[PDB]
Ligand binder design. Structure first.
Ligand SMILES: *[C@@H]1O[C@H](CO)[C@@H](O[C@@H]2O[C@H](CO)[C@@H](O)[C@H](O)[C@H]2NC(C)=O)[C@H](O)[C@H]1NC(C)=O
Ligand code: NAG
Lengths: 102, 1459
């Protein structure tokens, strides 16, 4: 029941504008489903950084894991149903980072 | 150009936020930062590969972090660091101070005041910089009211609520203000503090209140104030005649335990029918009376304290008022969210804000704003008076002066012009504004508007960004930065609006700025000459919306509870969370529980992590970034931060005597004079001036000032009683404050209910519950919940009652229903109690009050208890059960029966049958049975085992009075030995339970007993006899001694003990290695001539100090004290052997014994002593020494002695050092039959040595597997119990011998060792038999009614004229006859101290003092008031015995009435 306090960066792209907030997540396990990983990421953006409320919905979440790995989950669509089996290591991740398009 | 912001400082274990943002061109480019150590960019703690691009508008964040590298204490490590960044286009870095201030410590004391003997519940909440659980190891360190550590302890952080262990208050602690501090075990400088006051509970006879005209003192009354003081008994009847004494004072605050009184504070206007009054021209009483002669010159407090002693009874009651804040002008301006640098050309926004003496906003008030300014041209300007008036919803009086750009500094004065106030008394301020100088002529101003004083979360911030002025508008981008709690958390860029000037910026206030926030905003200006940064910023108060909404709701939401009702409690949270309940008696805080704030209390403190400062924004883009609590990393401008870093702080006839205080030259002389005259008419002023020790320096200040006050009472005025009040500054408080509850922590995933019944008790419970989780820390709104029963009777039963006396059982039934009502109290007739029924006597109670009750009775059955009481009301009928203690007259206990069961004839013979018979003393108080106990335990060390493991709570092993310090030490003994025994002789396996835990409990029992004494510890580390008394060298050791003994298993404070030794030595060790005793303390009466005794008395001390310095020596092994140790032993050899007494010898023996046990000479001494012994049955079966020394009067009259057993201990100990195993077997055969059921009967000094023996020896010899098979039995009556003893049970139950028969303990065969004790108690009617060692006289006078009892010591043959050693006086008070509490304190509490300790316990007045000289008597006096109506009374008992030798008991009957 590991409780790591990770830090993720938020950046809204209003075109030649960007309002960027730095902040934290809370992983309550030693290994988590990318589903739960994904349900938690948007859950907060949805409750905190204005997502799915207005021009917000299109973006790409970029999970950091190691000195060369960079992946995303289109916020344009929750169509990621096969990879939702994928599982991730708690103390591995280095820094989460999001970028917003309205 | 590039910007890289970062704090103005760093912290360890700090998630330091570091943004990078930049005006770089299209080419995206990499960026790695990191943290490197001073001049060698070698060490790099962490880094971050944060790549920017046009997609990220060239910006990015990085959580660096300096963990704990450099740990070399002493080295000035860590001071300064290099922050480093990297990229393709360049690289840069910096030096900027850092610290070890990570997180915070919150010390939730349960309640913030305690009385003797409560247990201070307490815990600690702890957060890191990031306001998360902050798991860690921490320690606090309690600190007595004088500032000397007293304990310590650490613990484990599982969640963040560090759960420390109860701290119990001393049975008699130092009175004042305690301090609890807290620090992280590991690295981190982080400071926790908190406090708590201990006050001395007293019993209230009658409630005296005191209400002041108003609550402050505004210029209206300054030559007057109407105070009304209202006294009244508990039985709903106000006082009539009473003397009134009222002091007053100044002070600074409410956290100051000391306030410099005033003279000429009016005595006497006689409380008159539940009142009286006065009016107090403040003018007079301060000018010459302290540093305040000016109204004005007062904005501090006014402290009040009355004393109302009732005229009829002779009682006394005291009552105080903390303070009464004076005020100049009832309003107080304070600028609001208004920065003090006016950018030029812009108009300056001045928002003042009036408030009242109570700190609410107050609208509709005038506000004249005179200003002044100077040109850059160094030309002045006197402006023109603007006047607004303060808003109604706002409390704000908005202004604006438009400023001639060439302005500079702007000084201005605000002030109310209330139309009704003296000009004088109009609240005002003054300030200063200054031009953000910038050579590019370029400035910035940002604003916004909201009508509410805070900006709720979720809202949105519209801020206008007017760059006004800059010679040009070629602005690319606006760039912002929002810190919060010392941490940047927001930043970005809005593309500038080409055409027009300013433009709006809209940042969503985020929960992440919860407590406050600042932001700042710079545009990068390309002056043709140089890259110029420019900015401004603001401070941003916001709504204290917590992270986790923790709320607590009571199942029955009723605003009052039935006392004992089961009632469910609710928790709740939008997120899983850790709660922490805590149910105080709301009483504490209470009387005007200052507005301040509940959850803000924390939120205030908690955000002093705001690195920056101000209303916002600086003086140079640098300054602006500075005050931001930042410094930033940019090549273009000077990212400096001048020198250091800004200690910013909140910009964002008894008078005729008191003149002779003119003889001040020291405090104590003031005490020599004050109490000096006090109130003594039973002895002249130079009679009292005799008993004066401290110094002749004061004796003058005594008799001078007494005479003055004595001629005086012949002129102020059968009622006369001078006074001049001064509680000596002692914390007293006429109210108890129950131990709190619901102190458990909890895990609550959004909901948790936990039902429970509330404690029977009259109070209002304030159950407050803090909760903490991953959001941070957040206080729930309290939830009061008074419990209370409408109407209820109480009965004031007495302690005890003598058979055959007629008692008056009082009490009072309580009405707290609004209207009045009808009741019906009836007493149940129990067998042997007498009464007036062969009944329902219905009465009426006026609403919201009380009707006294009474019932008379008279018991013939001694001990007979139980009385059920009952009242009746329309809607109720209740039964309160009570219990009456019934006694007889003249208690003496004779216990000398005792055996050792020795089946195996291991110690001198086979012992398998001893016989304790009936012996009714011909003085028996008829019809009272002879009660007797029979203590059968395995082992010679089983009595000393059972004592400590059958009761809990440490405890003294005699009936000896708790007075001394000594006694408070005699508590730590019985356990210590028993742990040294259990442990060192590993015998933990006695227990069927879990043993390891049994250990702890003993461990505790030790430490806590250990603190029990602190109170008697003086300043210079010298200990002392009775509290505060002149440090006694004797007890300075005796503690040393038992301090170093218990060091074995309870690490004692090094530097404490250290100085503790280095006191005796460096100061009290004569130029011959002997030790002079400081105080006047006589512990023991030594025999011999006045010359002899001196030489004798010197030896004894020098014997005892050694023992001490020895016992403890090992924790402060020290050259300078090893030395003295020999200088000491030397005197000892070189001065013992022409032996003066066996006692003398024996300590001098035992003490060399704890050293070089081989000095030929020691052999001679050991010989001498060893020579002196005597003995019982041949060959020897019992060996022991006598008090004397070869004068052989041989009077060992079948009876032990405190000094006897003390001596033989001292030899038995010496032997048991030298391992003389066969010499000793008879010595202990007889200790172990001396010792009195429970503990070492005779006195103290013996029974610690005596106990040290009996352990040491059962330690040194080897134990004899027990397996007896006892059978106690009546000679004629059939058999009583009989039980196979083993190592399973051996500390078996005690048993009282009921019937009337001769007794017989009588094991079968077996093995091991059983100490049969049998302590038989009987009540006799006469002392005519007994031995008087003290001359007495006791009688009850009338000049209402008061007791004058006397004494003189009866010197035994060979004894010095000086008379007694340390001694007590013990007066029994006739059933129901309270004595003058205030009378005694008088006797002791002074430099004319006739006694030195008083204490009324369970019906007895018990006085301690040093001597009872035999030149004449020594007499106490105190007065008494029948607390009720007592029939034919059986007299009480005035007794007087010498502390150290209980052998000297002259006991005597007397009666408090001639009837
Ligand atoms: C007052 O005292 C009497 C006797 O001590 C109490 O009598 C008892 O009542 C309880 C409750 O039913 C019984 O369990 C006991 O057996 C009774 N004791 C005896 C031996 O009589 C009585 O309860 C008390 N008065 C009240 C009403 O509280
Ligand atoms: C006390 O003595 C003074 C001086 O002799 C006298 O004048 C005065 O009357 C006396 N006090 C009073 C008020 O009786």
């Amino acid at each position: 029941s590991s409780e790591t306090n990770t830090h993720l960066f938020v950046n809204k792209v209003y075109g030649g504008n960007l309002d960027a907030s730095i902040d934290s997540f809370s992983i309550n396990k030693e290994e988590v489903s990318l589903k739960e990983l994904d349900f938690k990421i948007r859950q907060h953006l949805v409750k905190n950084y204005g997502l799915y409320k207005g021009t917000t919905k299109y973006g790409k979440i970029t999970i950091n894991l190691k000195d060369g790995e960079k992946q995303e989950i289109d916020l344009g669509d929750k169509l990621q149903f096969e990879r939702m089996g994928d599982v991730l290591n708690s103390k591995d991740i280095n820094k989460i980072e999001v970028t917003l398009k309205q | 150009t590039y910007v890289i912001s970062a704090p103005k400082i760093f912290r360890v274990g700090a998630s330091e936020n570091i943004v990078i943002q930049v005006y770089g061109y299209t080419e995206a480019f990499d960026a790695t930062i990191s943290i490197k150590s001073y001049p060698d960019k070698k060490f790099s703690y962490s880094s971050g590969h944060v790549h920017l691009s046009s997609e990220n508008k060239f910006q990015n964040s990085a959580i660096l972090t300096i963990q704990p590298k450099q740990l070399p204490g002493g080295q000035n490590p860590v001071s300064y660091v290099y922050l480093e960044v990297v990229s393709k286009h360049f690289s840069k870095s910096k030096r900027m101070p850092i610290t070890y201030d990570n997180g915070f410590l919150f010390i939730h004391t349960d309640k913030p005041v305690y009385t003797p003997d409560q247990s201070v519940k307490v815990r600690v909440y702890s957060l890191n910089d990031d306001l998360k659980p902050a798991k860690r190891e921490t320690v606090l360190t309690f600190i007595d009211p004088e500032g000397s550590e007293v304990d310590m302890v650490e613990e484990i952080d599982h969640i963040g609520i560090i759960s420390f262990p109860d701290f119990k208050i001393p049975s008699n602690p130092r009175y004042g203000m305690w301090t609890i501090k807290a620090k992280y075990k590991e690295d981190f400088s982080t400071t926790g503090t908190a406090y708590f006051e201990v006050k001395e509970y007293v019993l209230p006879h009658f409630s005296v209140s005191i209400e002041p005209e108003y609550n402050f003192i505004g210029y209206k009354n300054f030559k007057n104030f109407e105070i009304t003081i209202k006294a009244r008994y508990f039985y709903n009847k106000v006082v009539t005649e009473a003397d009134v004494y009222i002091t007053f004072g100044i002070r600074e605050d409410l956290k100051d335990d000391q306030k410099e009184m005033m003279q000429t504070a009016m005595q006497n206007t006689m409380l008159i029918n539940g009142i009286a009054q006065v009016t107090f021209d403040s003018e007079t009483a301060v000018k010459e009376l302290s540093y305040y002669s000016l109204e004005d010159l007062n904005n501090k407090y006014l402290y009040i304290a009355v004393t109302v002693i009732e005229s009829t009874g002779g009682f006394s009651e005291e009552a105080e008022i903390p303070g009464i804040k004076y005020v100049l002008s009832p309003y107080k301006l304070n600028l609001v969210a208004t920065p003090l640098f006016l950018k030029p050309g812009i108009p300056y926004p001045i928002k003042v804000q009036v408030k009242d003496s109570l700190d609410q906003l107050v609208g509709g008030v005038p506000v004249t704003l005179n200003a002044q300014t100077i040109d850059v041209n160094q030309e002045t300007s006197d402006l023109d008076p603007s006047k607004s008036v303060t808003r109604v919803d706002d409390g704000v009086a908005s202004f604006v002066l438009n400023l001639p750009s060439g302005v500079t500094v702007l000084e201005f004065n605000v002030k109310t012009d209330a139309p009704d106030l003296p000009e004088e008394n109009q609240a005002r301020e003054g300030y200063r504004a200054i031009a953000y100088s910038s050579l590019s002529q370029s400035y910035l101003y940002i604003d916004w508007t909201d009508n509410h004083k805070a900006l709720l979360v979720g809202e949105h911030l519209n801020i206008i960004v007017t760059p006004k002025s800059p010679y040009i508008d070629k602005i690319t981008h606006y760039n912002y930065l929002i810190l919060s709690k010392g941490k940047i958390i927001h930043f970005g860029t809005r593309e500038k609006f080409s055409d027009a000037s300013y433009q709006s910026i809209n940042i969503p206030v985020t929960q992440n700025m919860v407590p406050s926030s600042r932001l700042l905003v710079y545009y990068i200006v390309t002056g043709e000459q140089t890259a110029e940064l420019v900015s401004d910023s603001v401070w941003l108060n916001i709504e204290e919306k917590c992270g986790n909404q923790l709320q607590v709701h009571l199942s029955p939401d009723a605003d009052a509870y039935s006392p004992g009702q089961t009632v469910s409690l609710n928790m709740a949270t939008g997120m899983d969370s850790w709660v922490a309940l805590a149910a105080v008696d709301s009483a504490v805080y209470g009387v005007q529980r200052g507005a301040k704030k509940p959850l803000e209390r924390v939120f205030q403190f908690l955000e002093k992590s705001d690195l920056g400062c101000g209303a916002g924004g600086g003086l140079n883009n640098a300054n602006v970034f500075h005050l931001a609590g930042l410094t930033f990393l940019t090549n273009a401008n000077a990212d400096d931060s001048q020198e250091n870093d800004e200690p910013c702080k909140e910009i964002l006839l008894q008078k005729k005597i008191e003149e002779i205080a003119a003889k001040y030259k020291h405090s104590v002389v003031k005490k020599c004079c004050y109490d000096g005259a006090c109130v003594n008419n039973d002895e002249t002023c130079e009679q009292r001036a005799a008993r004066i020790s401290l110094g002749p320096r004061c004796i003058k200040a005594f008799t001078e000032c007494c005479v003055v006050a004595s001629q005086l009472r012949a002129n102020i005025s059968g009622r006369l009683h001078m006074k001049t009040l001064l509680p000596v500054s002692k914390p007293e408080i006429r109210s108890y404050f129950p131990e709190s509850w619901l102190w458990e922590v909890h895990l609550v995933p959004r909901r948790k209910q936990l039902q429970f019944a509330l404690p029977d008790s009259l109070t209002t419970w304030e159950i407050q519950g803090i909760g903490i989780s991953n959001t941070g820390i957040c206080v729930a709104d309290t939830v009061k919940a008074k419990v209370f029963k409408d109407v209820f009777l109480e009965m004031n039963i007495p302690y005890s009652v003598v058979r055959g006396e007629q008692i008056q059982l009082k009490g009072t039934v309580y009405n707290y229903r609004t209207s009045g009502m009808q009741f019906c109290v009836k007493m149940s007739a129990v067998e042997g109690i007498c009464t007036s029924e062969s009944k329902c006597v219905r009465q009426k109670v006026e609403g919201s009050s009380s009707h006294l009750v009474t019932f008379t009775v008279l018991p013939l059955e001694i001990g007979l208890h139980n009385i059920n009481f009952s009242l009746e009301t329309w809607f109720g009928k209740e039964i309160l059960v009570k219990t009456l203690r019934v006694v007889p007259e003249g208690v003496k206990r004779e216990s000398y029966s005792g055996v050792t069961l020795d089946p195996r004839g291991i110690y001198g013979t086979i012992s398998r049958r001893k016989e304790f018979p009936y012996r009714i003393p011909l003085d028996l108080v008829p019809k009272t049975e002879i009660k007797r106990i029979l203590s059968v335990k395995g082992l010679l060390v089983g009595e000393i085992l059972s004592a400590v493991l059958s009761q809990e709570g440490i405890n003294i092993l005699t009936h000896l009075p708790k007075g001394s310090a000594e006694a408070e030490l005699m508590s730590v003994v019985p356990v210590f030995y028993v742990f040294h025994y259990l442990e060192t002789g590993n015998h933990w396996n006695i227990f069927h339970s879990d043993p390891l835990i049994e250990k702890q409990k003993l461990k505790k029992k030790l430490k806590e007993g250990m603190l029990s004494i602190m109170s008697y510890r003086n300043a210079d580390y010298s200990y002392s006899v009775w509290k505060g008394g002149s440090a006694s060298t004797w007890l300075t050791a005796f503690a040393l001694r038992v301090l170093g003994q218990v060091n074995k298993y309870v690490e004692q404070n090094q530097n404490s003990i250290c100085n503790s030794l280095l006191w005796l030595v460096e100061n009290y060790q004569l130029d011959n290695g002997s030790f002079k005793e400081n105080s006047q303390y006589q512990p023991i009466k030594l025999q011999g001539t006045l010359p002899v005794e001196a030489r004798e008395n010197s030896l004894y001390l020098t014997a005892f100090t050694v023992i001490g310095i020895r016992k403890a020596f090992d924790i402060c092994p020290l050259v300078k004290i090893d030395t003295a140790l020999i200088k000491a032993d030397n005197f000892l050899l070189e001065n013992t052997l022409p032996a003066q007494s066996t006692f003398t010898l024996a300590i001098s023996a035992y003490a060399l014994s704890l050293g070089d046990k081989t000095h030929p000479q020691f052999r001679s001494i050991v010989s001498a002593l060893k020579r002196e012994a005597l003995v019982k049955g041949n060959p020897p079966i019992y060996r022991f020494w006598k008090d004397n020394l070869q004068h052989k009067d041989s009077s060992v009259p079948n009876t032990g002695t405190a000094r006897m057993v003390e001596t033989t201990a001292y030899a038995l100990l010496t032997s048991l050092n030298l391992k003389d195993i066969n010499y000793v077997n008879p010595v202990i055969k007889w200790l172990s039959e001396e010792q009195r059921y429970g503990g070492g009967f005779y006195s103290t000094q013996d029974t610690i040595n005596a106990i040290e023996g009996l352990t040491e020896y059962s330690l040194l010899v080897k134990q004899l597997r027990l397996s007896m098979d006892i059978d106690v039995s009546y000679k004629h009556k059939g058999a009583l119990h009989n039980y196979k003893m083993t190592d399973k049970n051996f500390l078996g139950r005690p048993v009282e011998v009921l019937l009337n028969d001769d007794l017989i303990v009588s094991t079968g065969f077996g093995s091991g060792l059983a100490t049969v004790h049998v302590t038989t108690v009987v009540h006799k009617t006469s002392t005519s038999e007994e031995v008087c060692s003290f001359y007495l006289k006791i009688d009850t006078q009338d000049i209402y009614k008061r007791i004058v009892a006397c004494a003189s010591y009866k010197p035994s043959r060979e004894e010095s004229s000086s008379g007694s050693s340390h001694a007590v006086m013990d007066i029994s008070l006739p059933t129901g006859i309270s004595a003058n509490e205030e009378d005694l304190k008088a006797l002791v509490e002074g430099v004319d101290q006739l006694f030195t300790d008083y204490q009324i316990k369970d019906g007895h007045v018990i006085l301690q003092l040093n001597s009872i000289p035999s030149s004449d008597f020594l007499c106490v006096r105190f007065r008494i008031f029948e607390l009720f109506e007592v029939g034919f009374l059986s007299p009480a008992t005035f007794t007087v015995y010498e502390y150290h030798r209980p052998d000297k008991q002259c006991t005597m009957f007397y009666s408090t009435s001639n009837i």
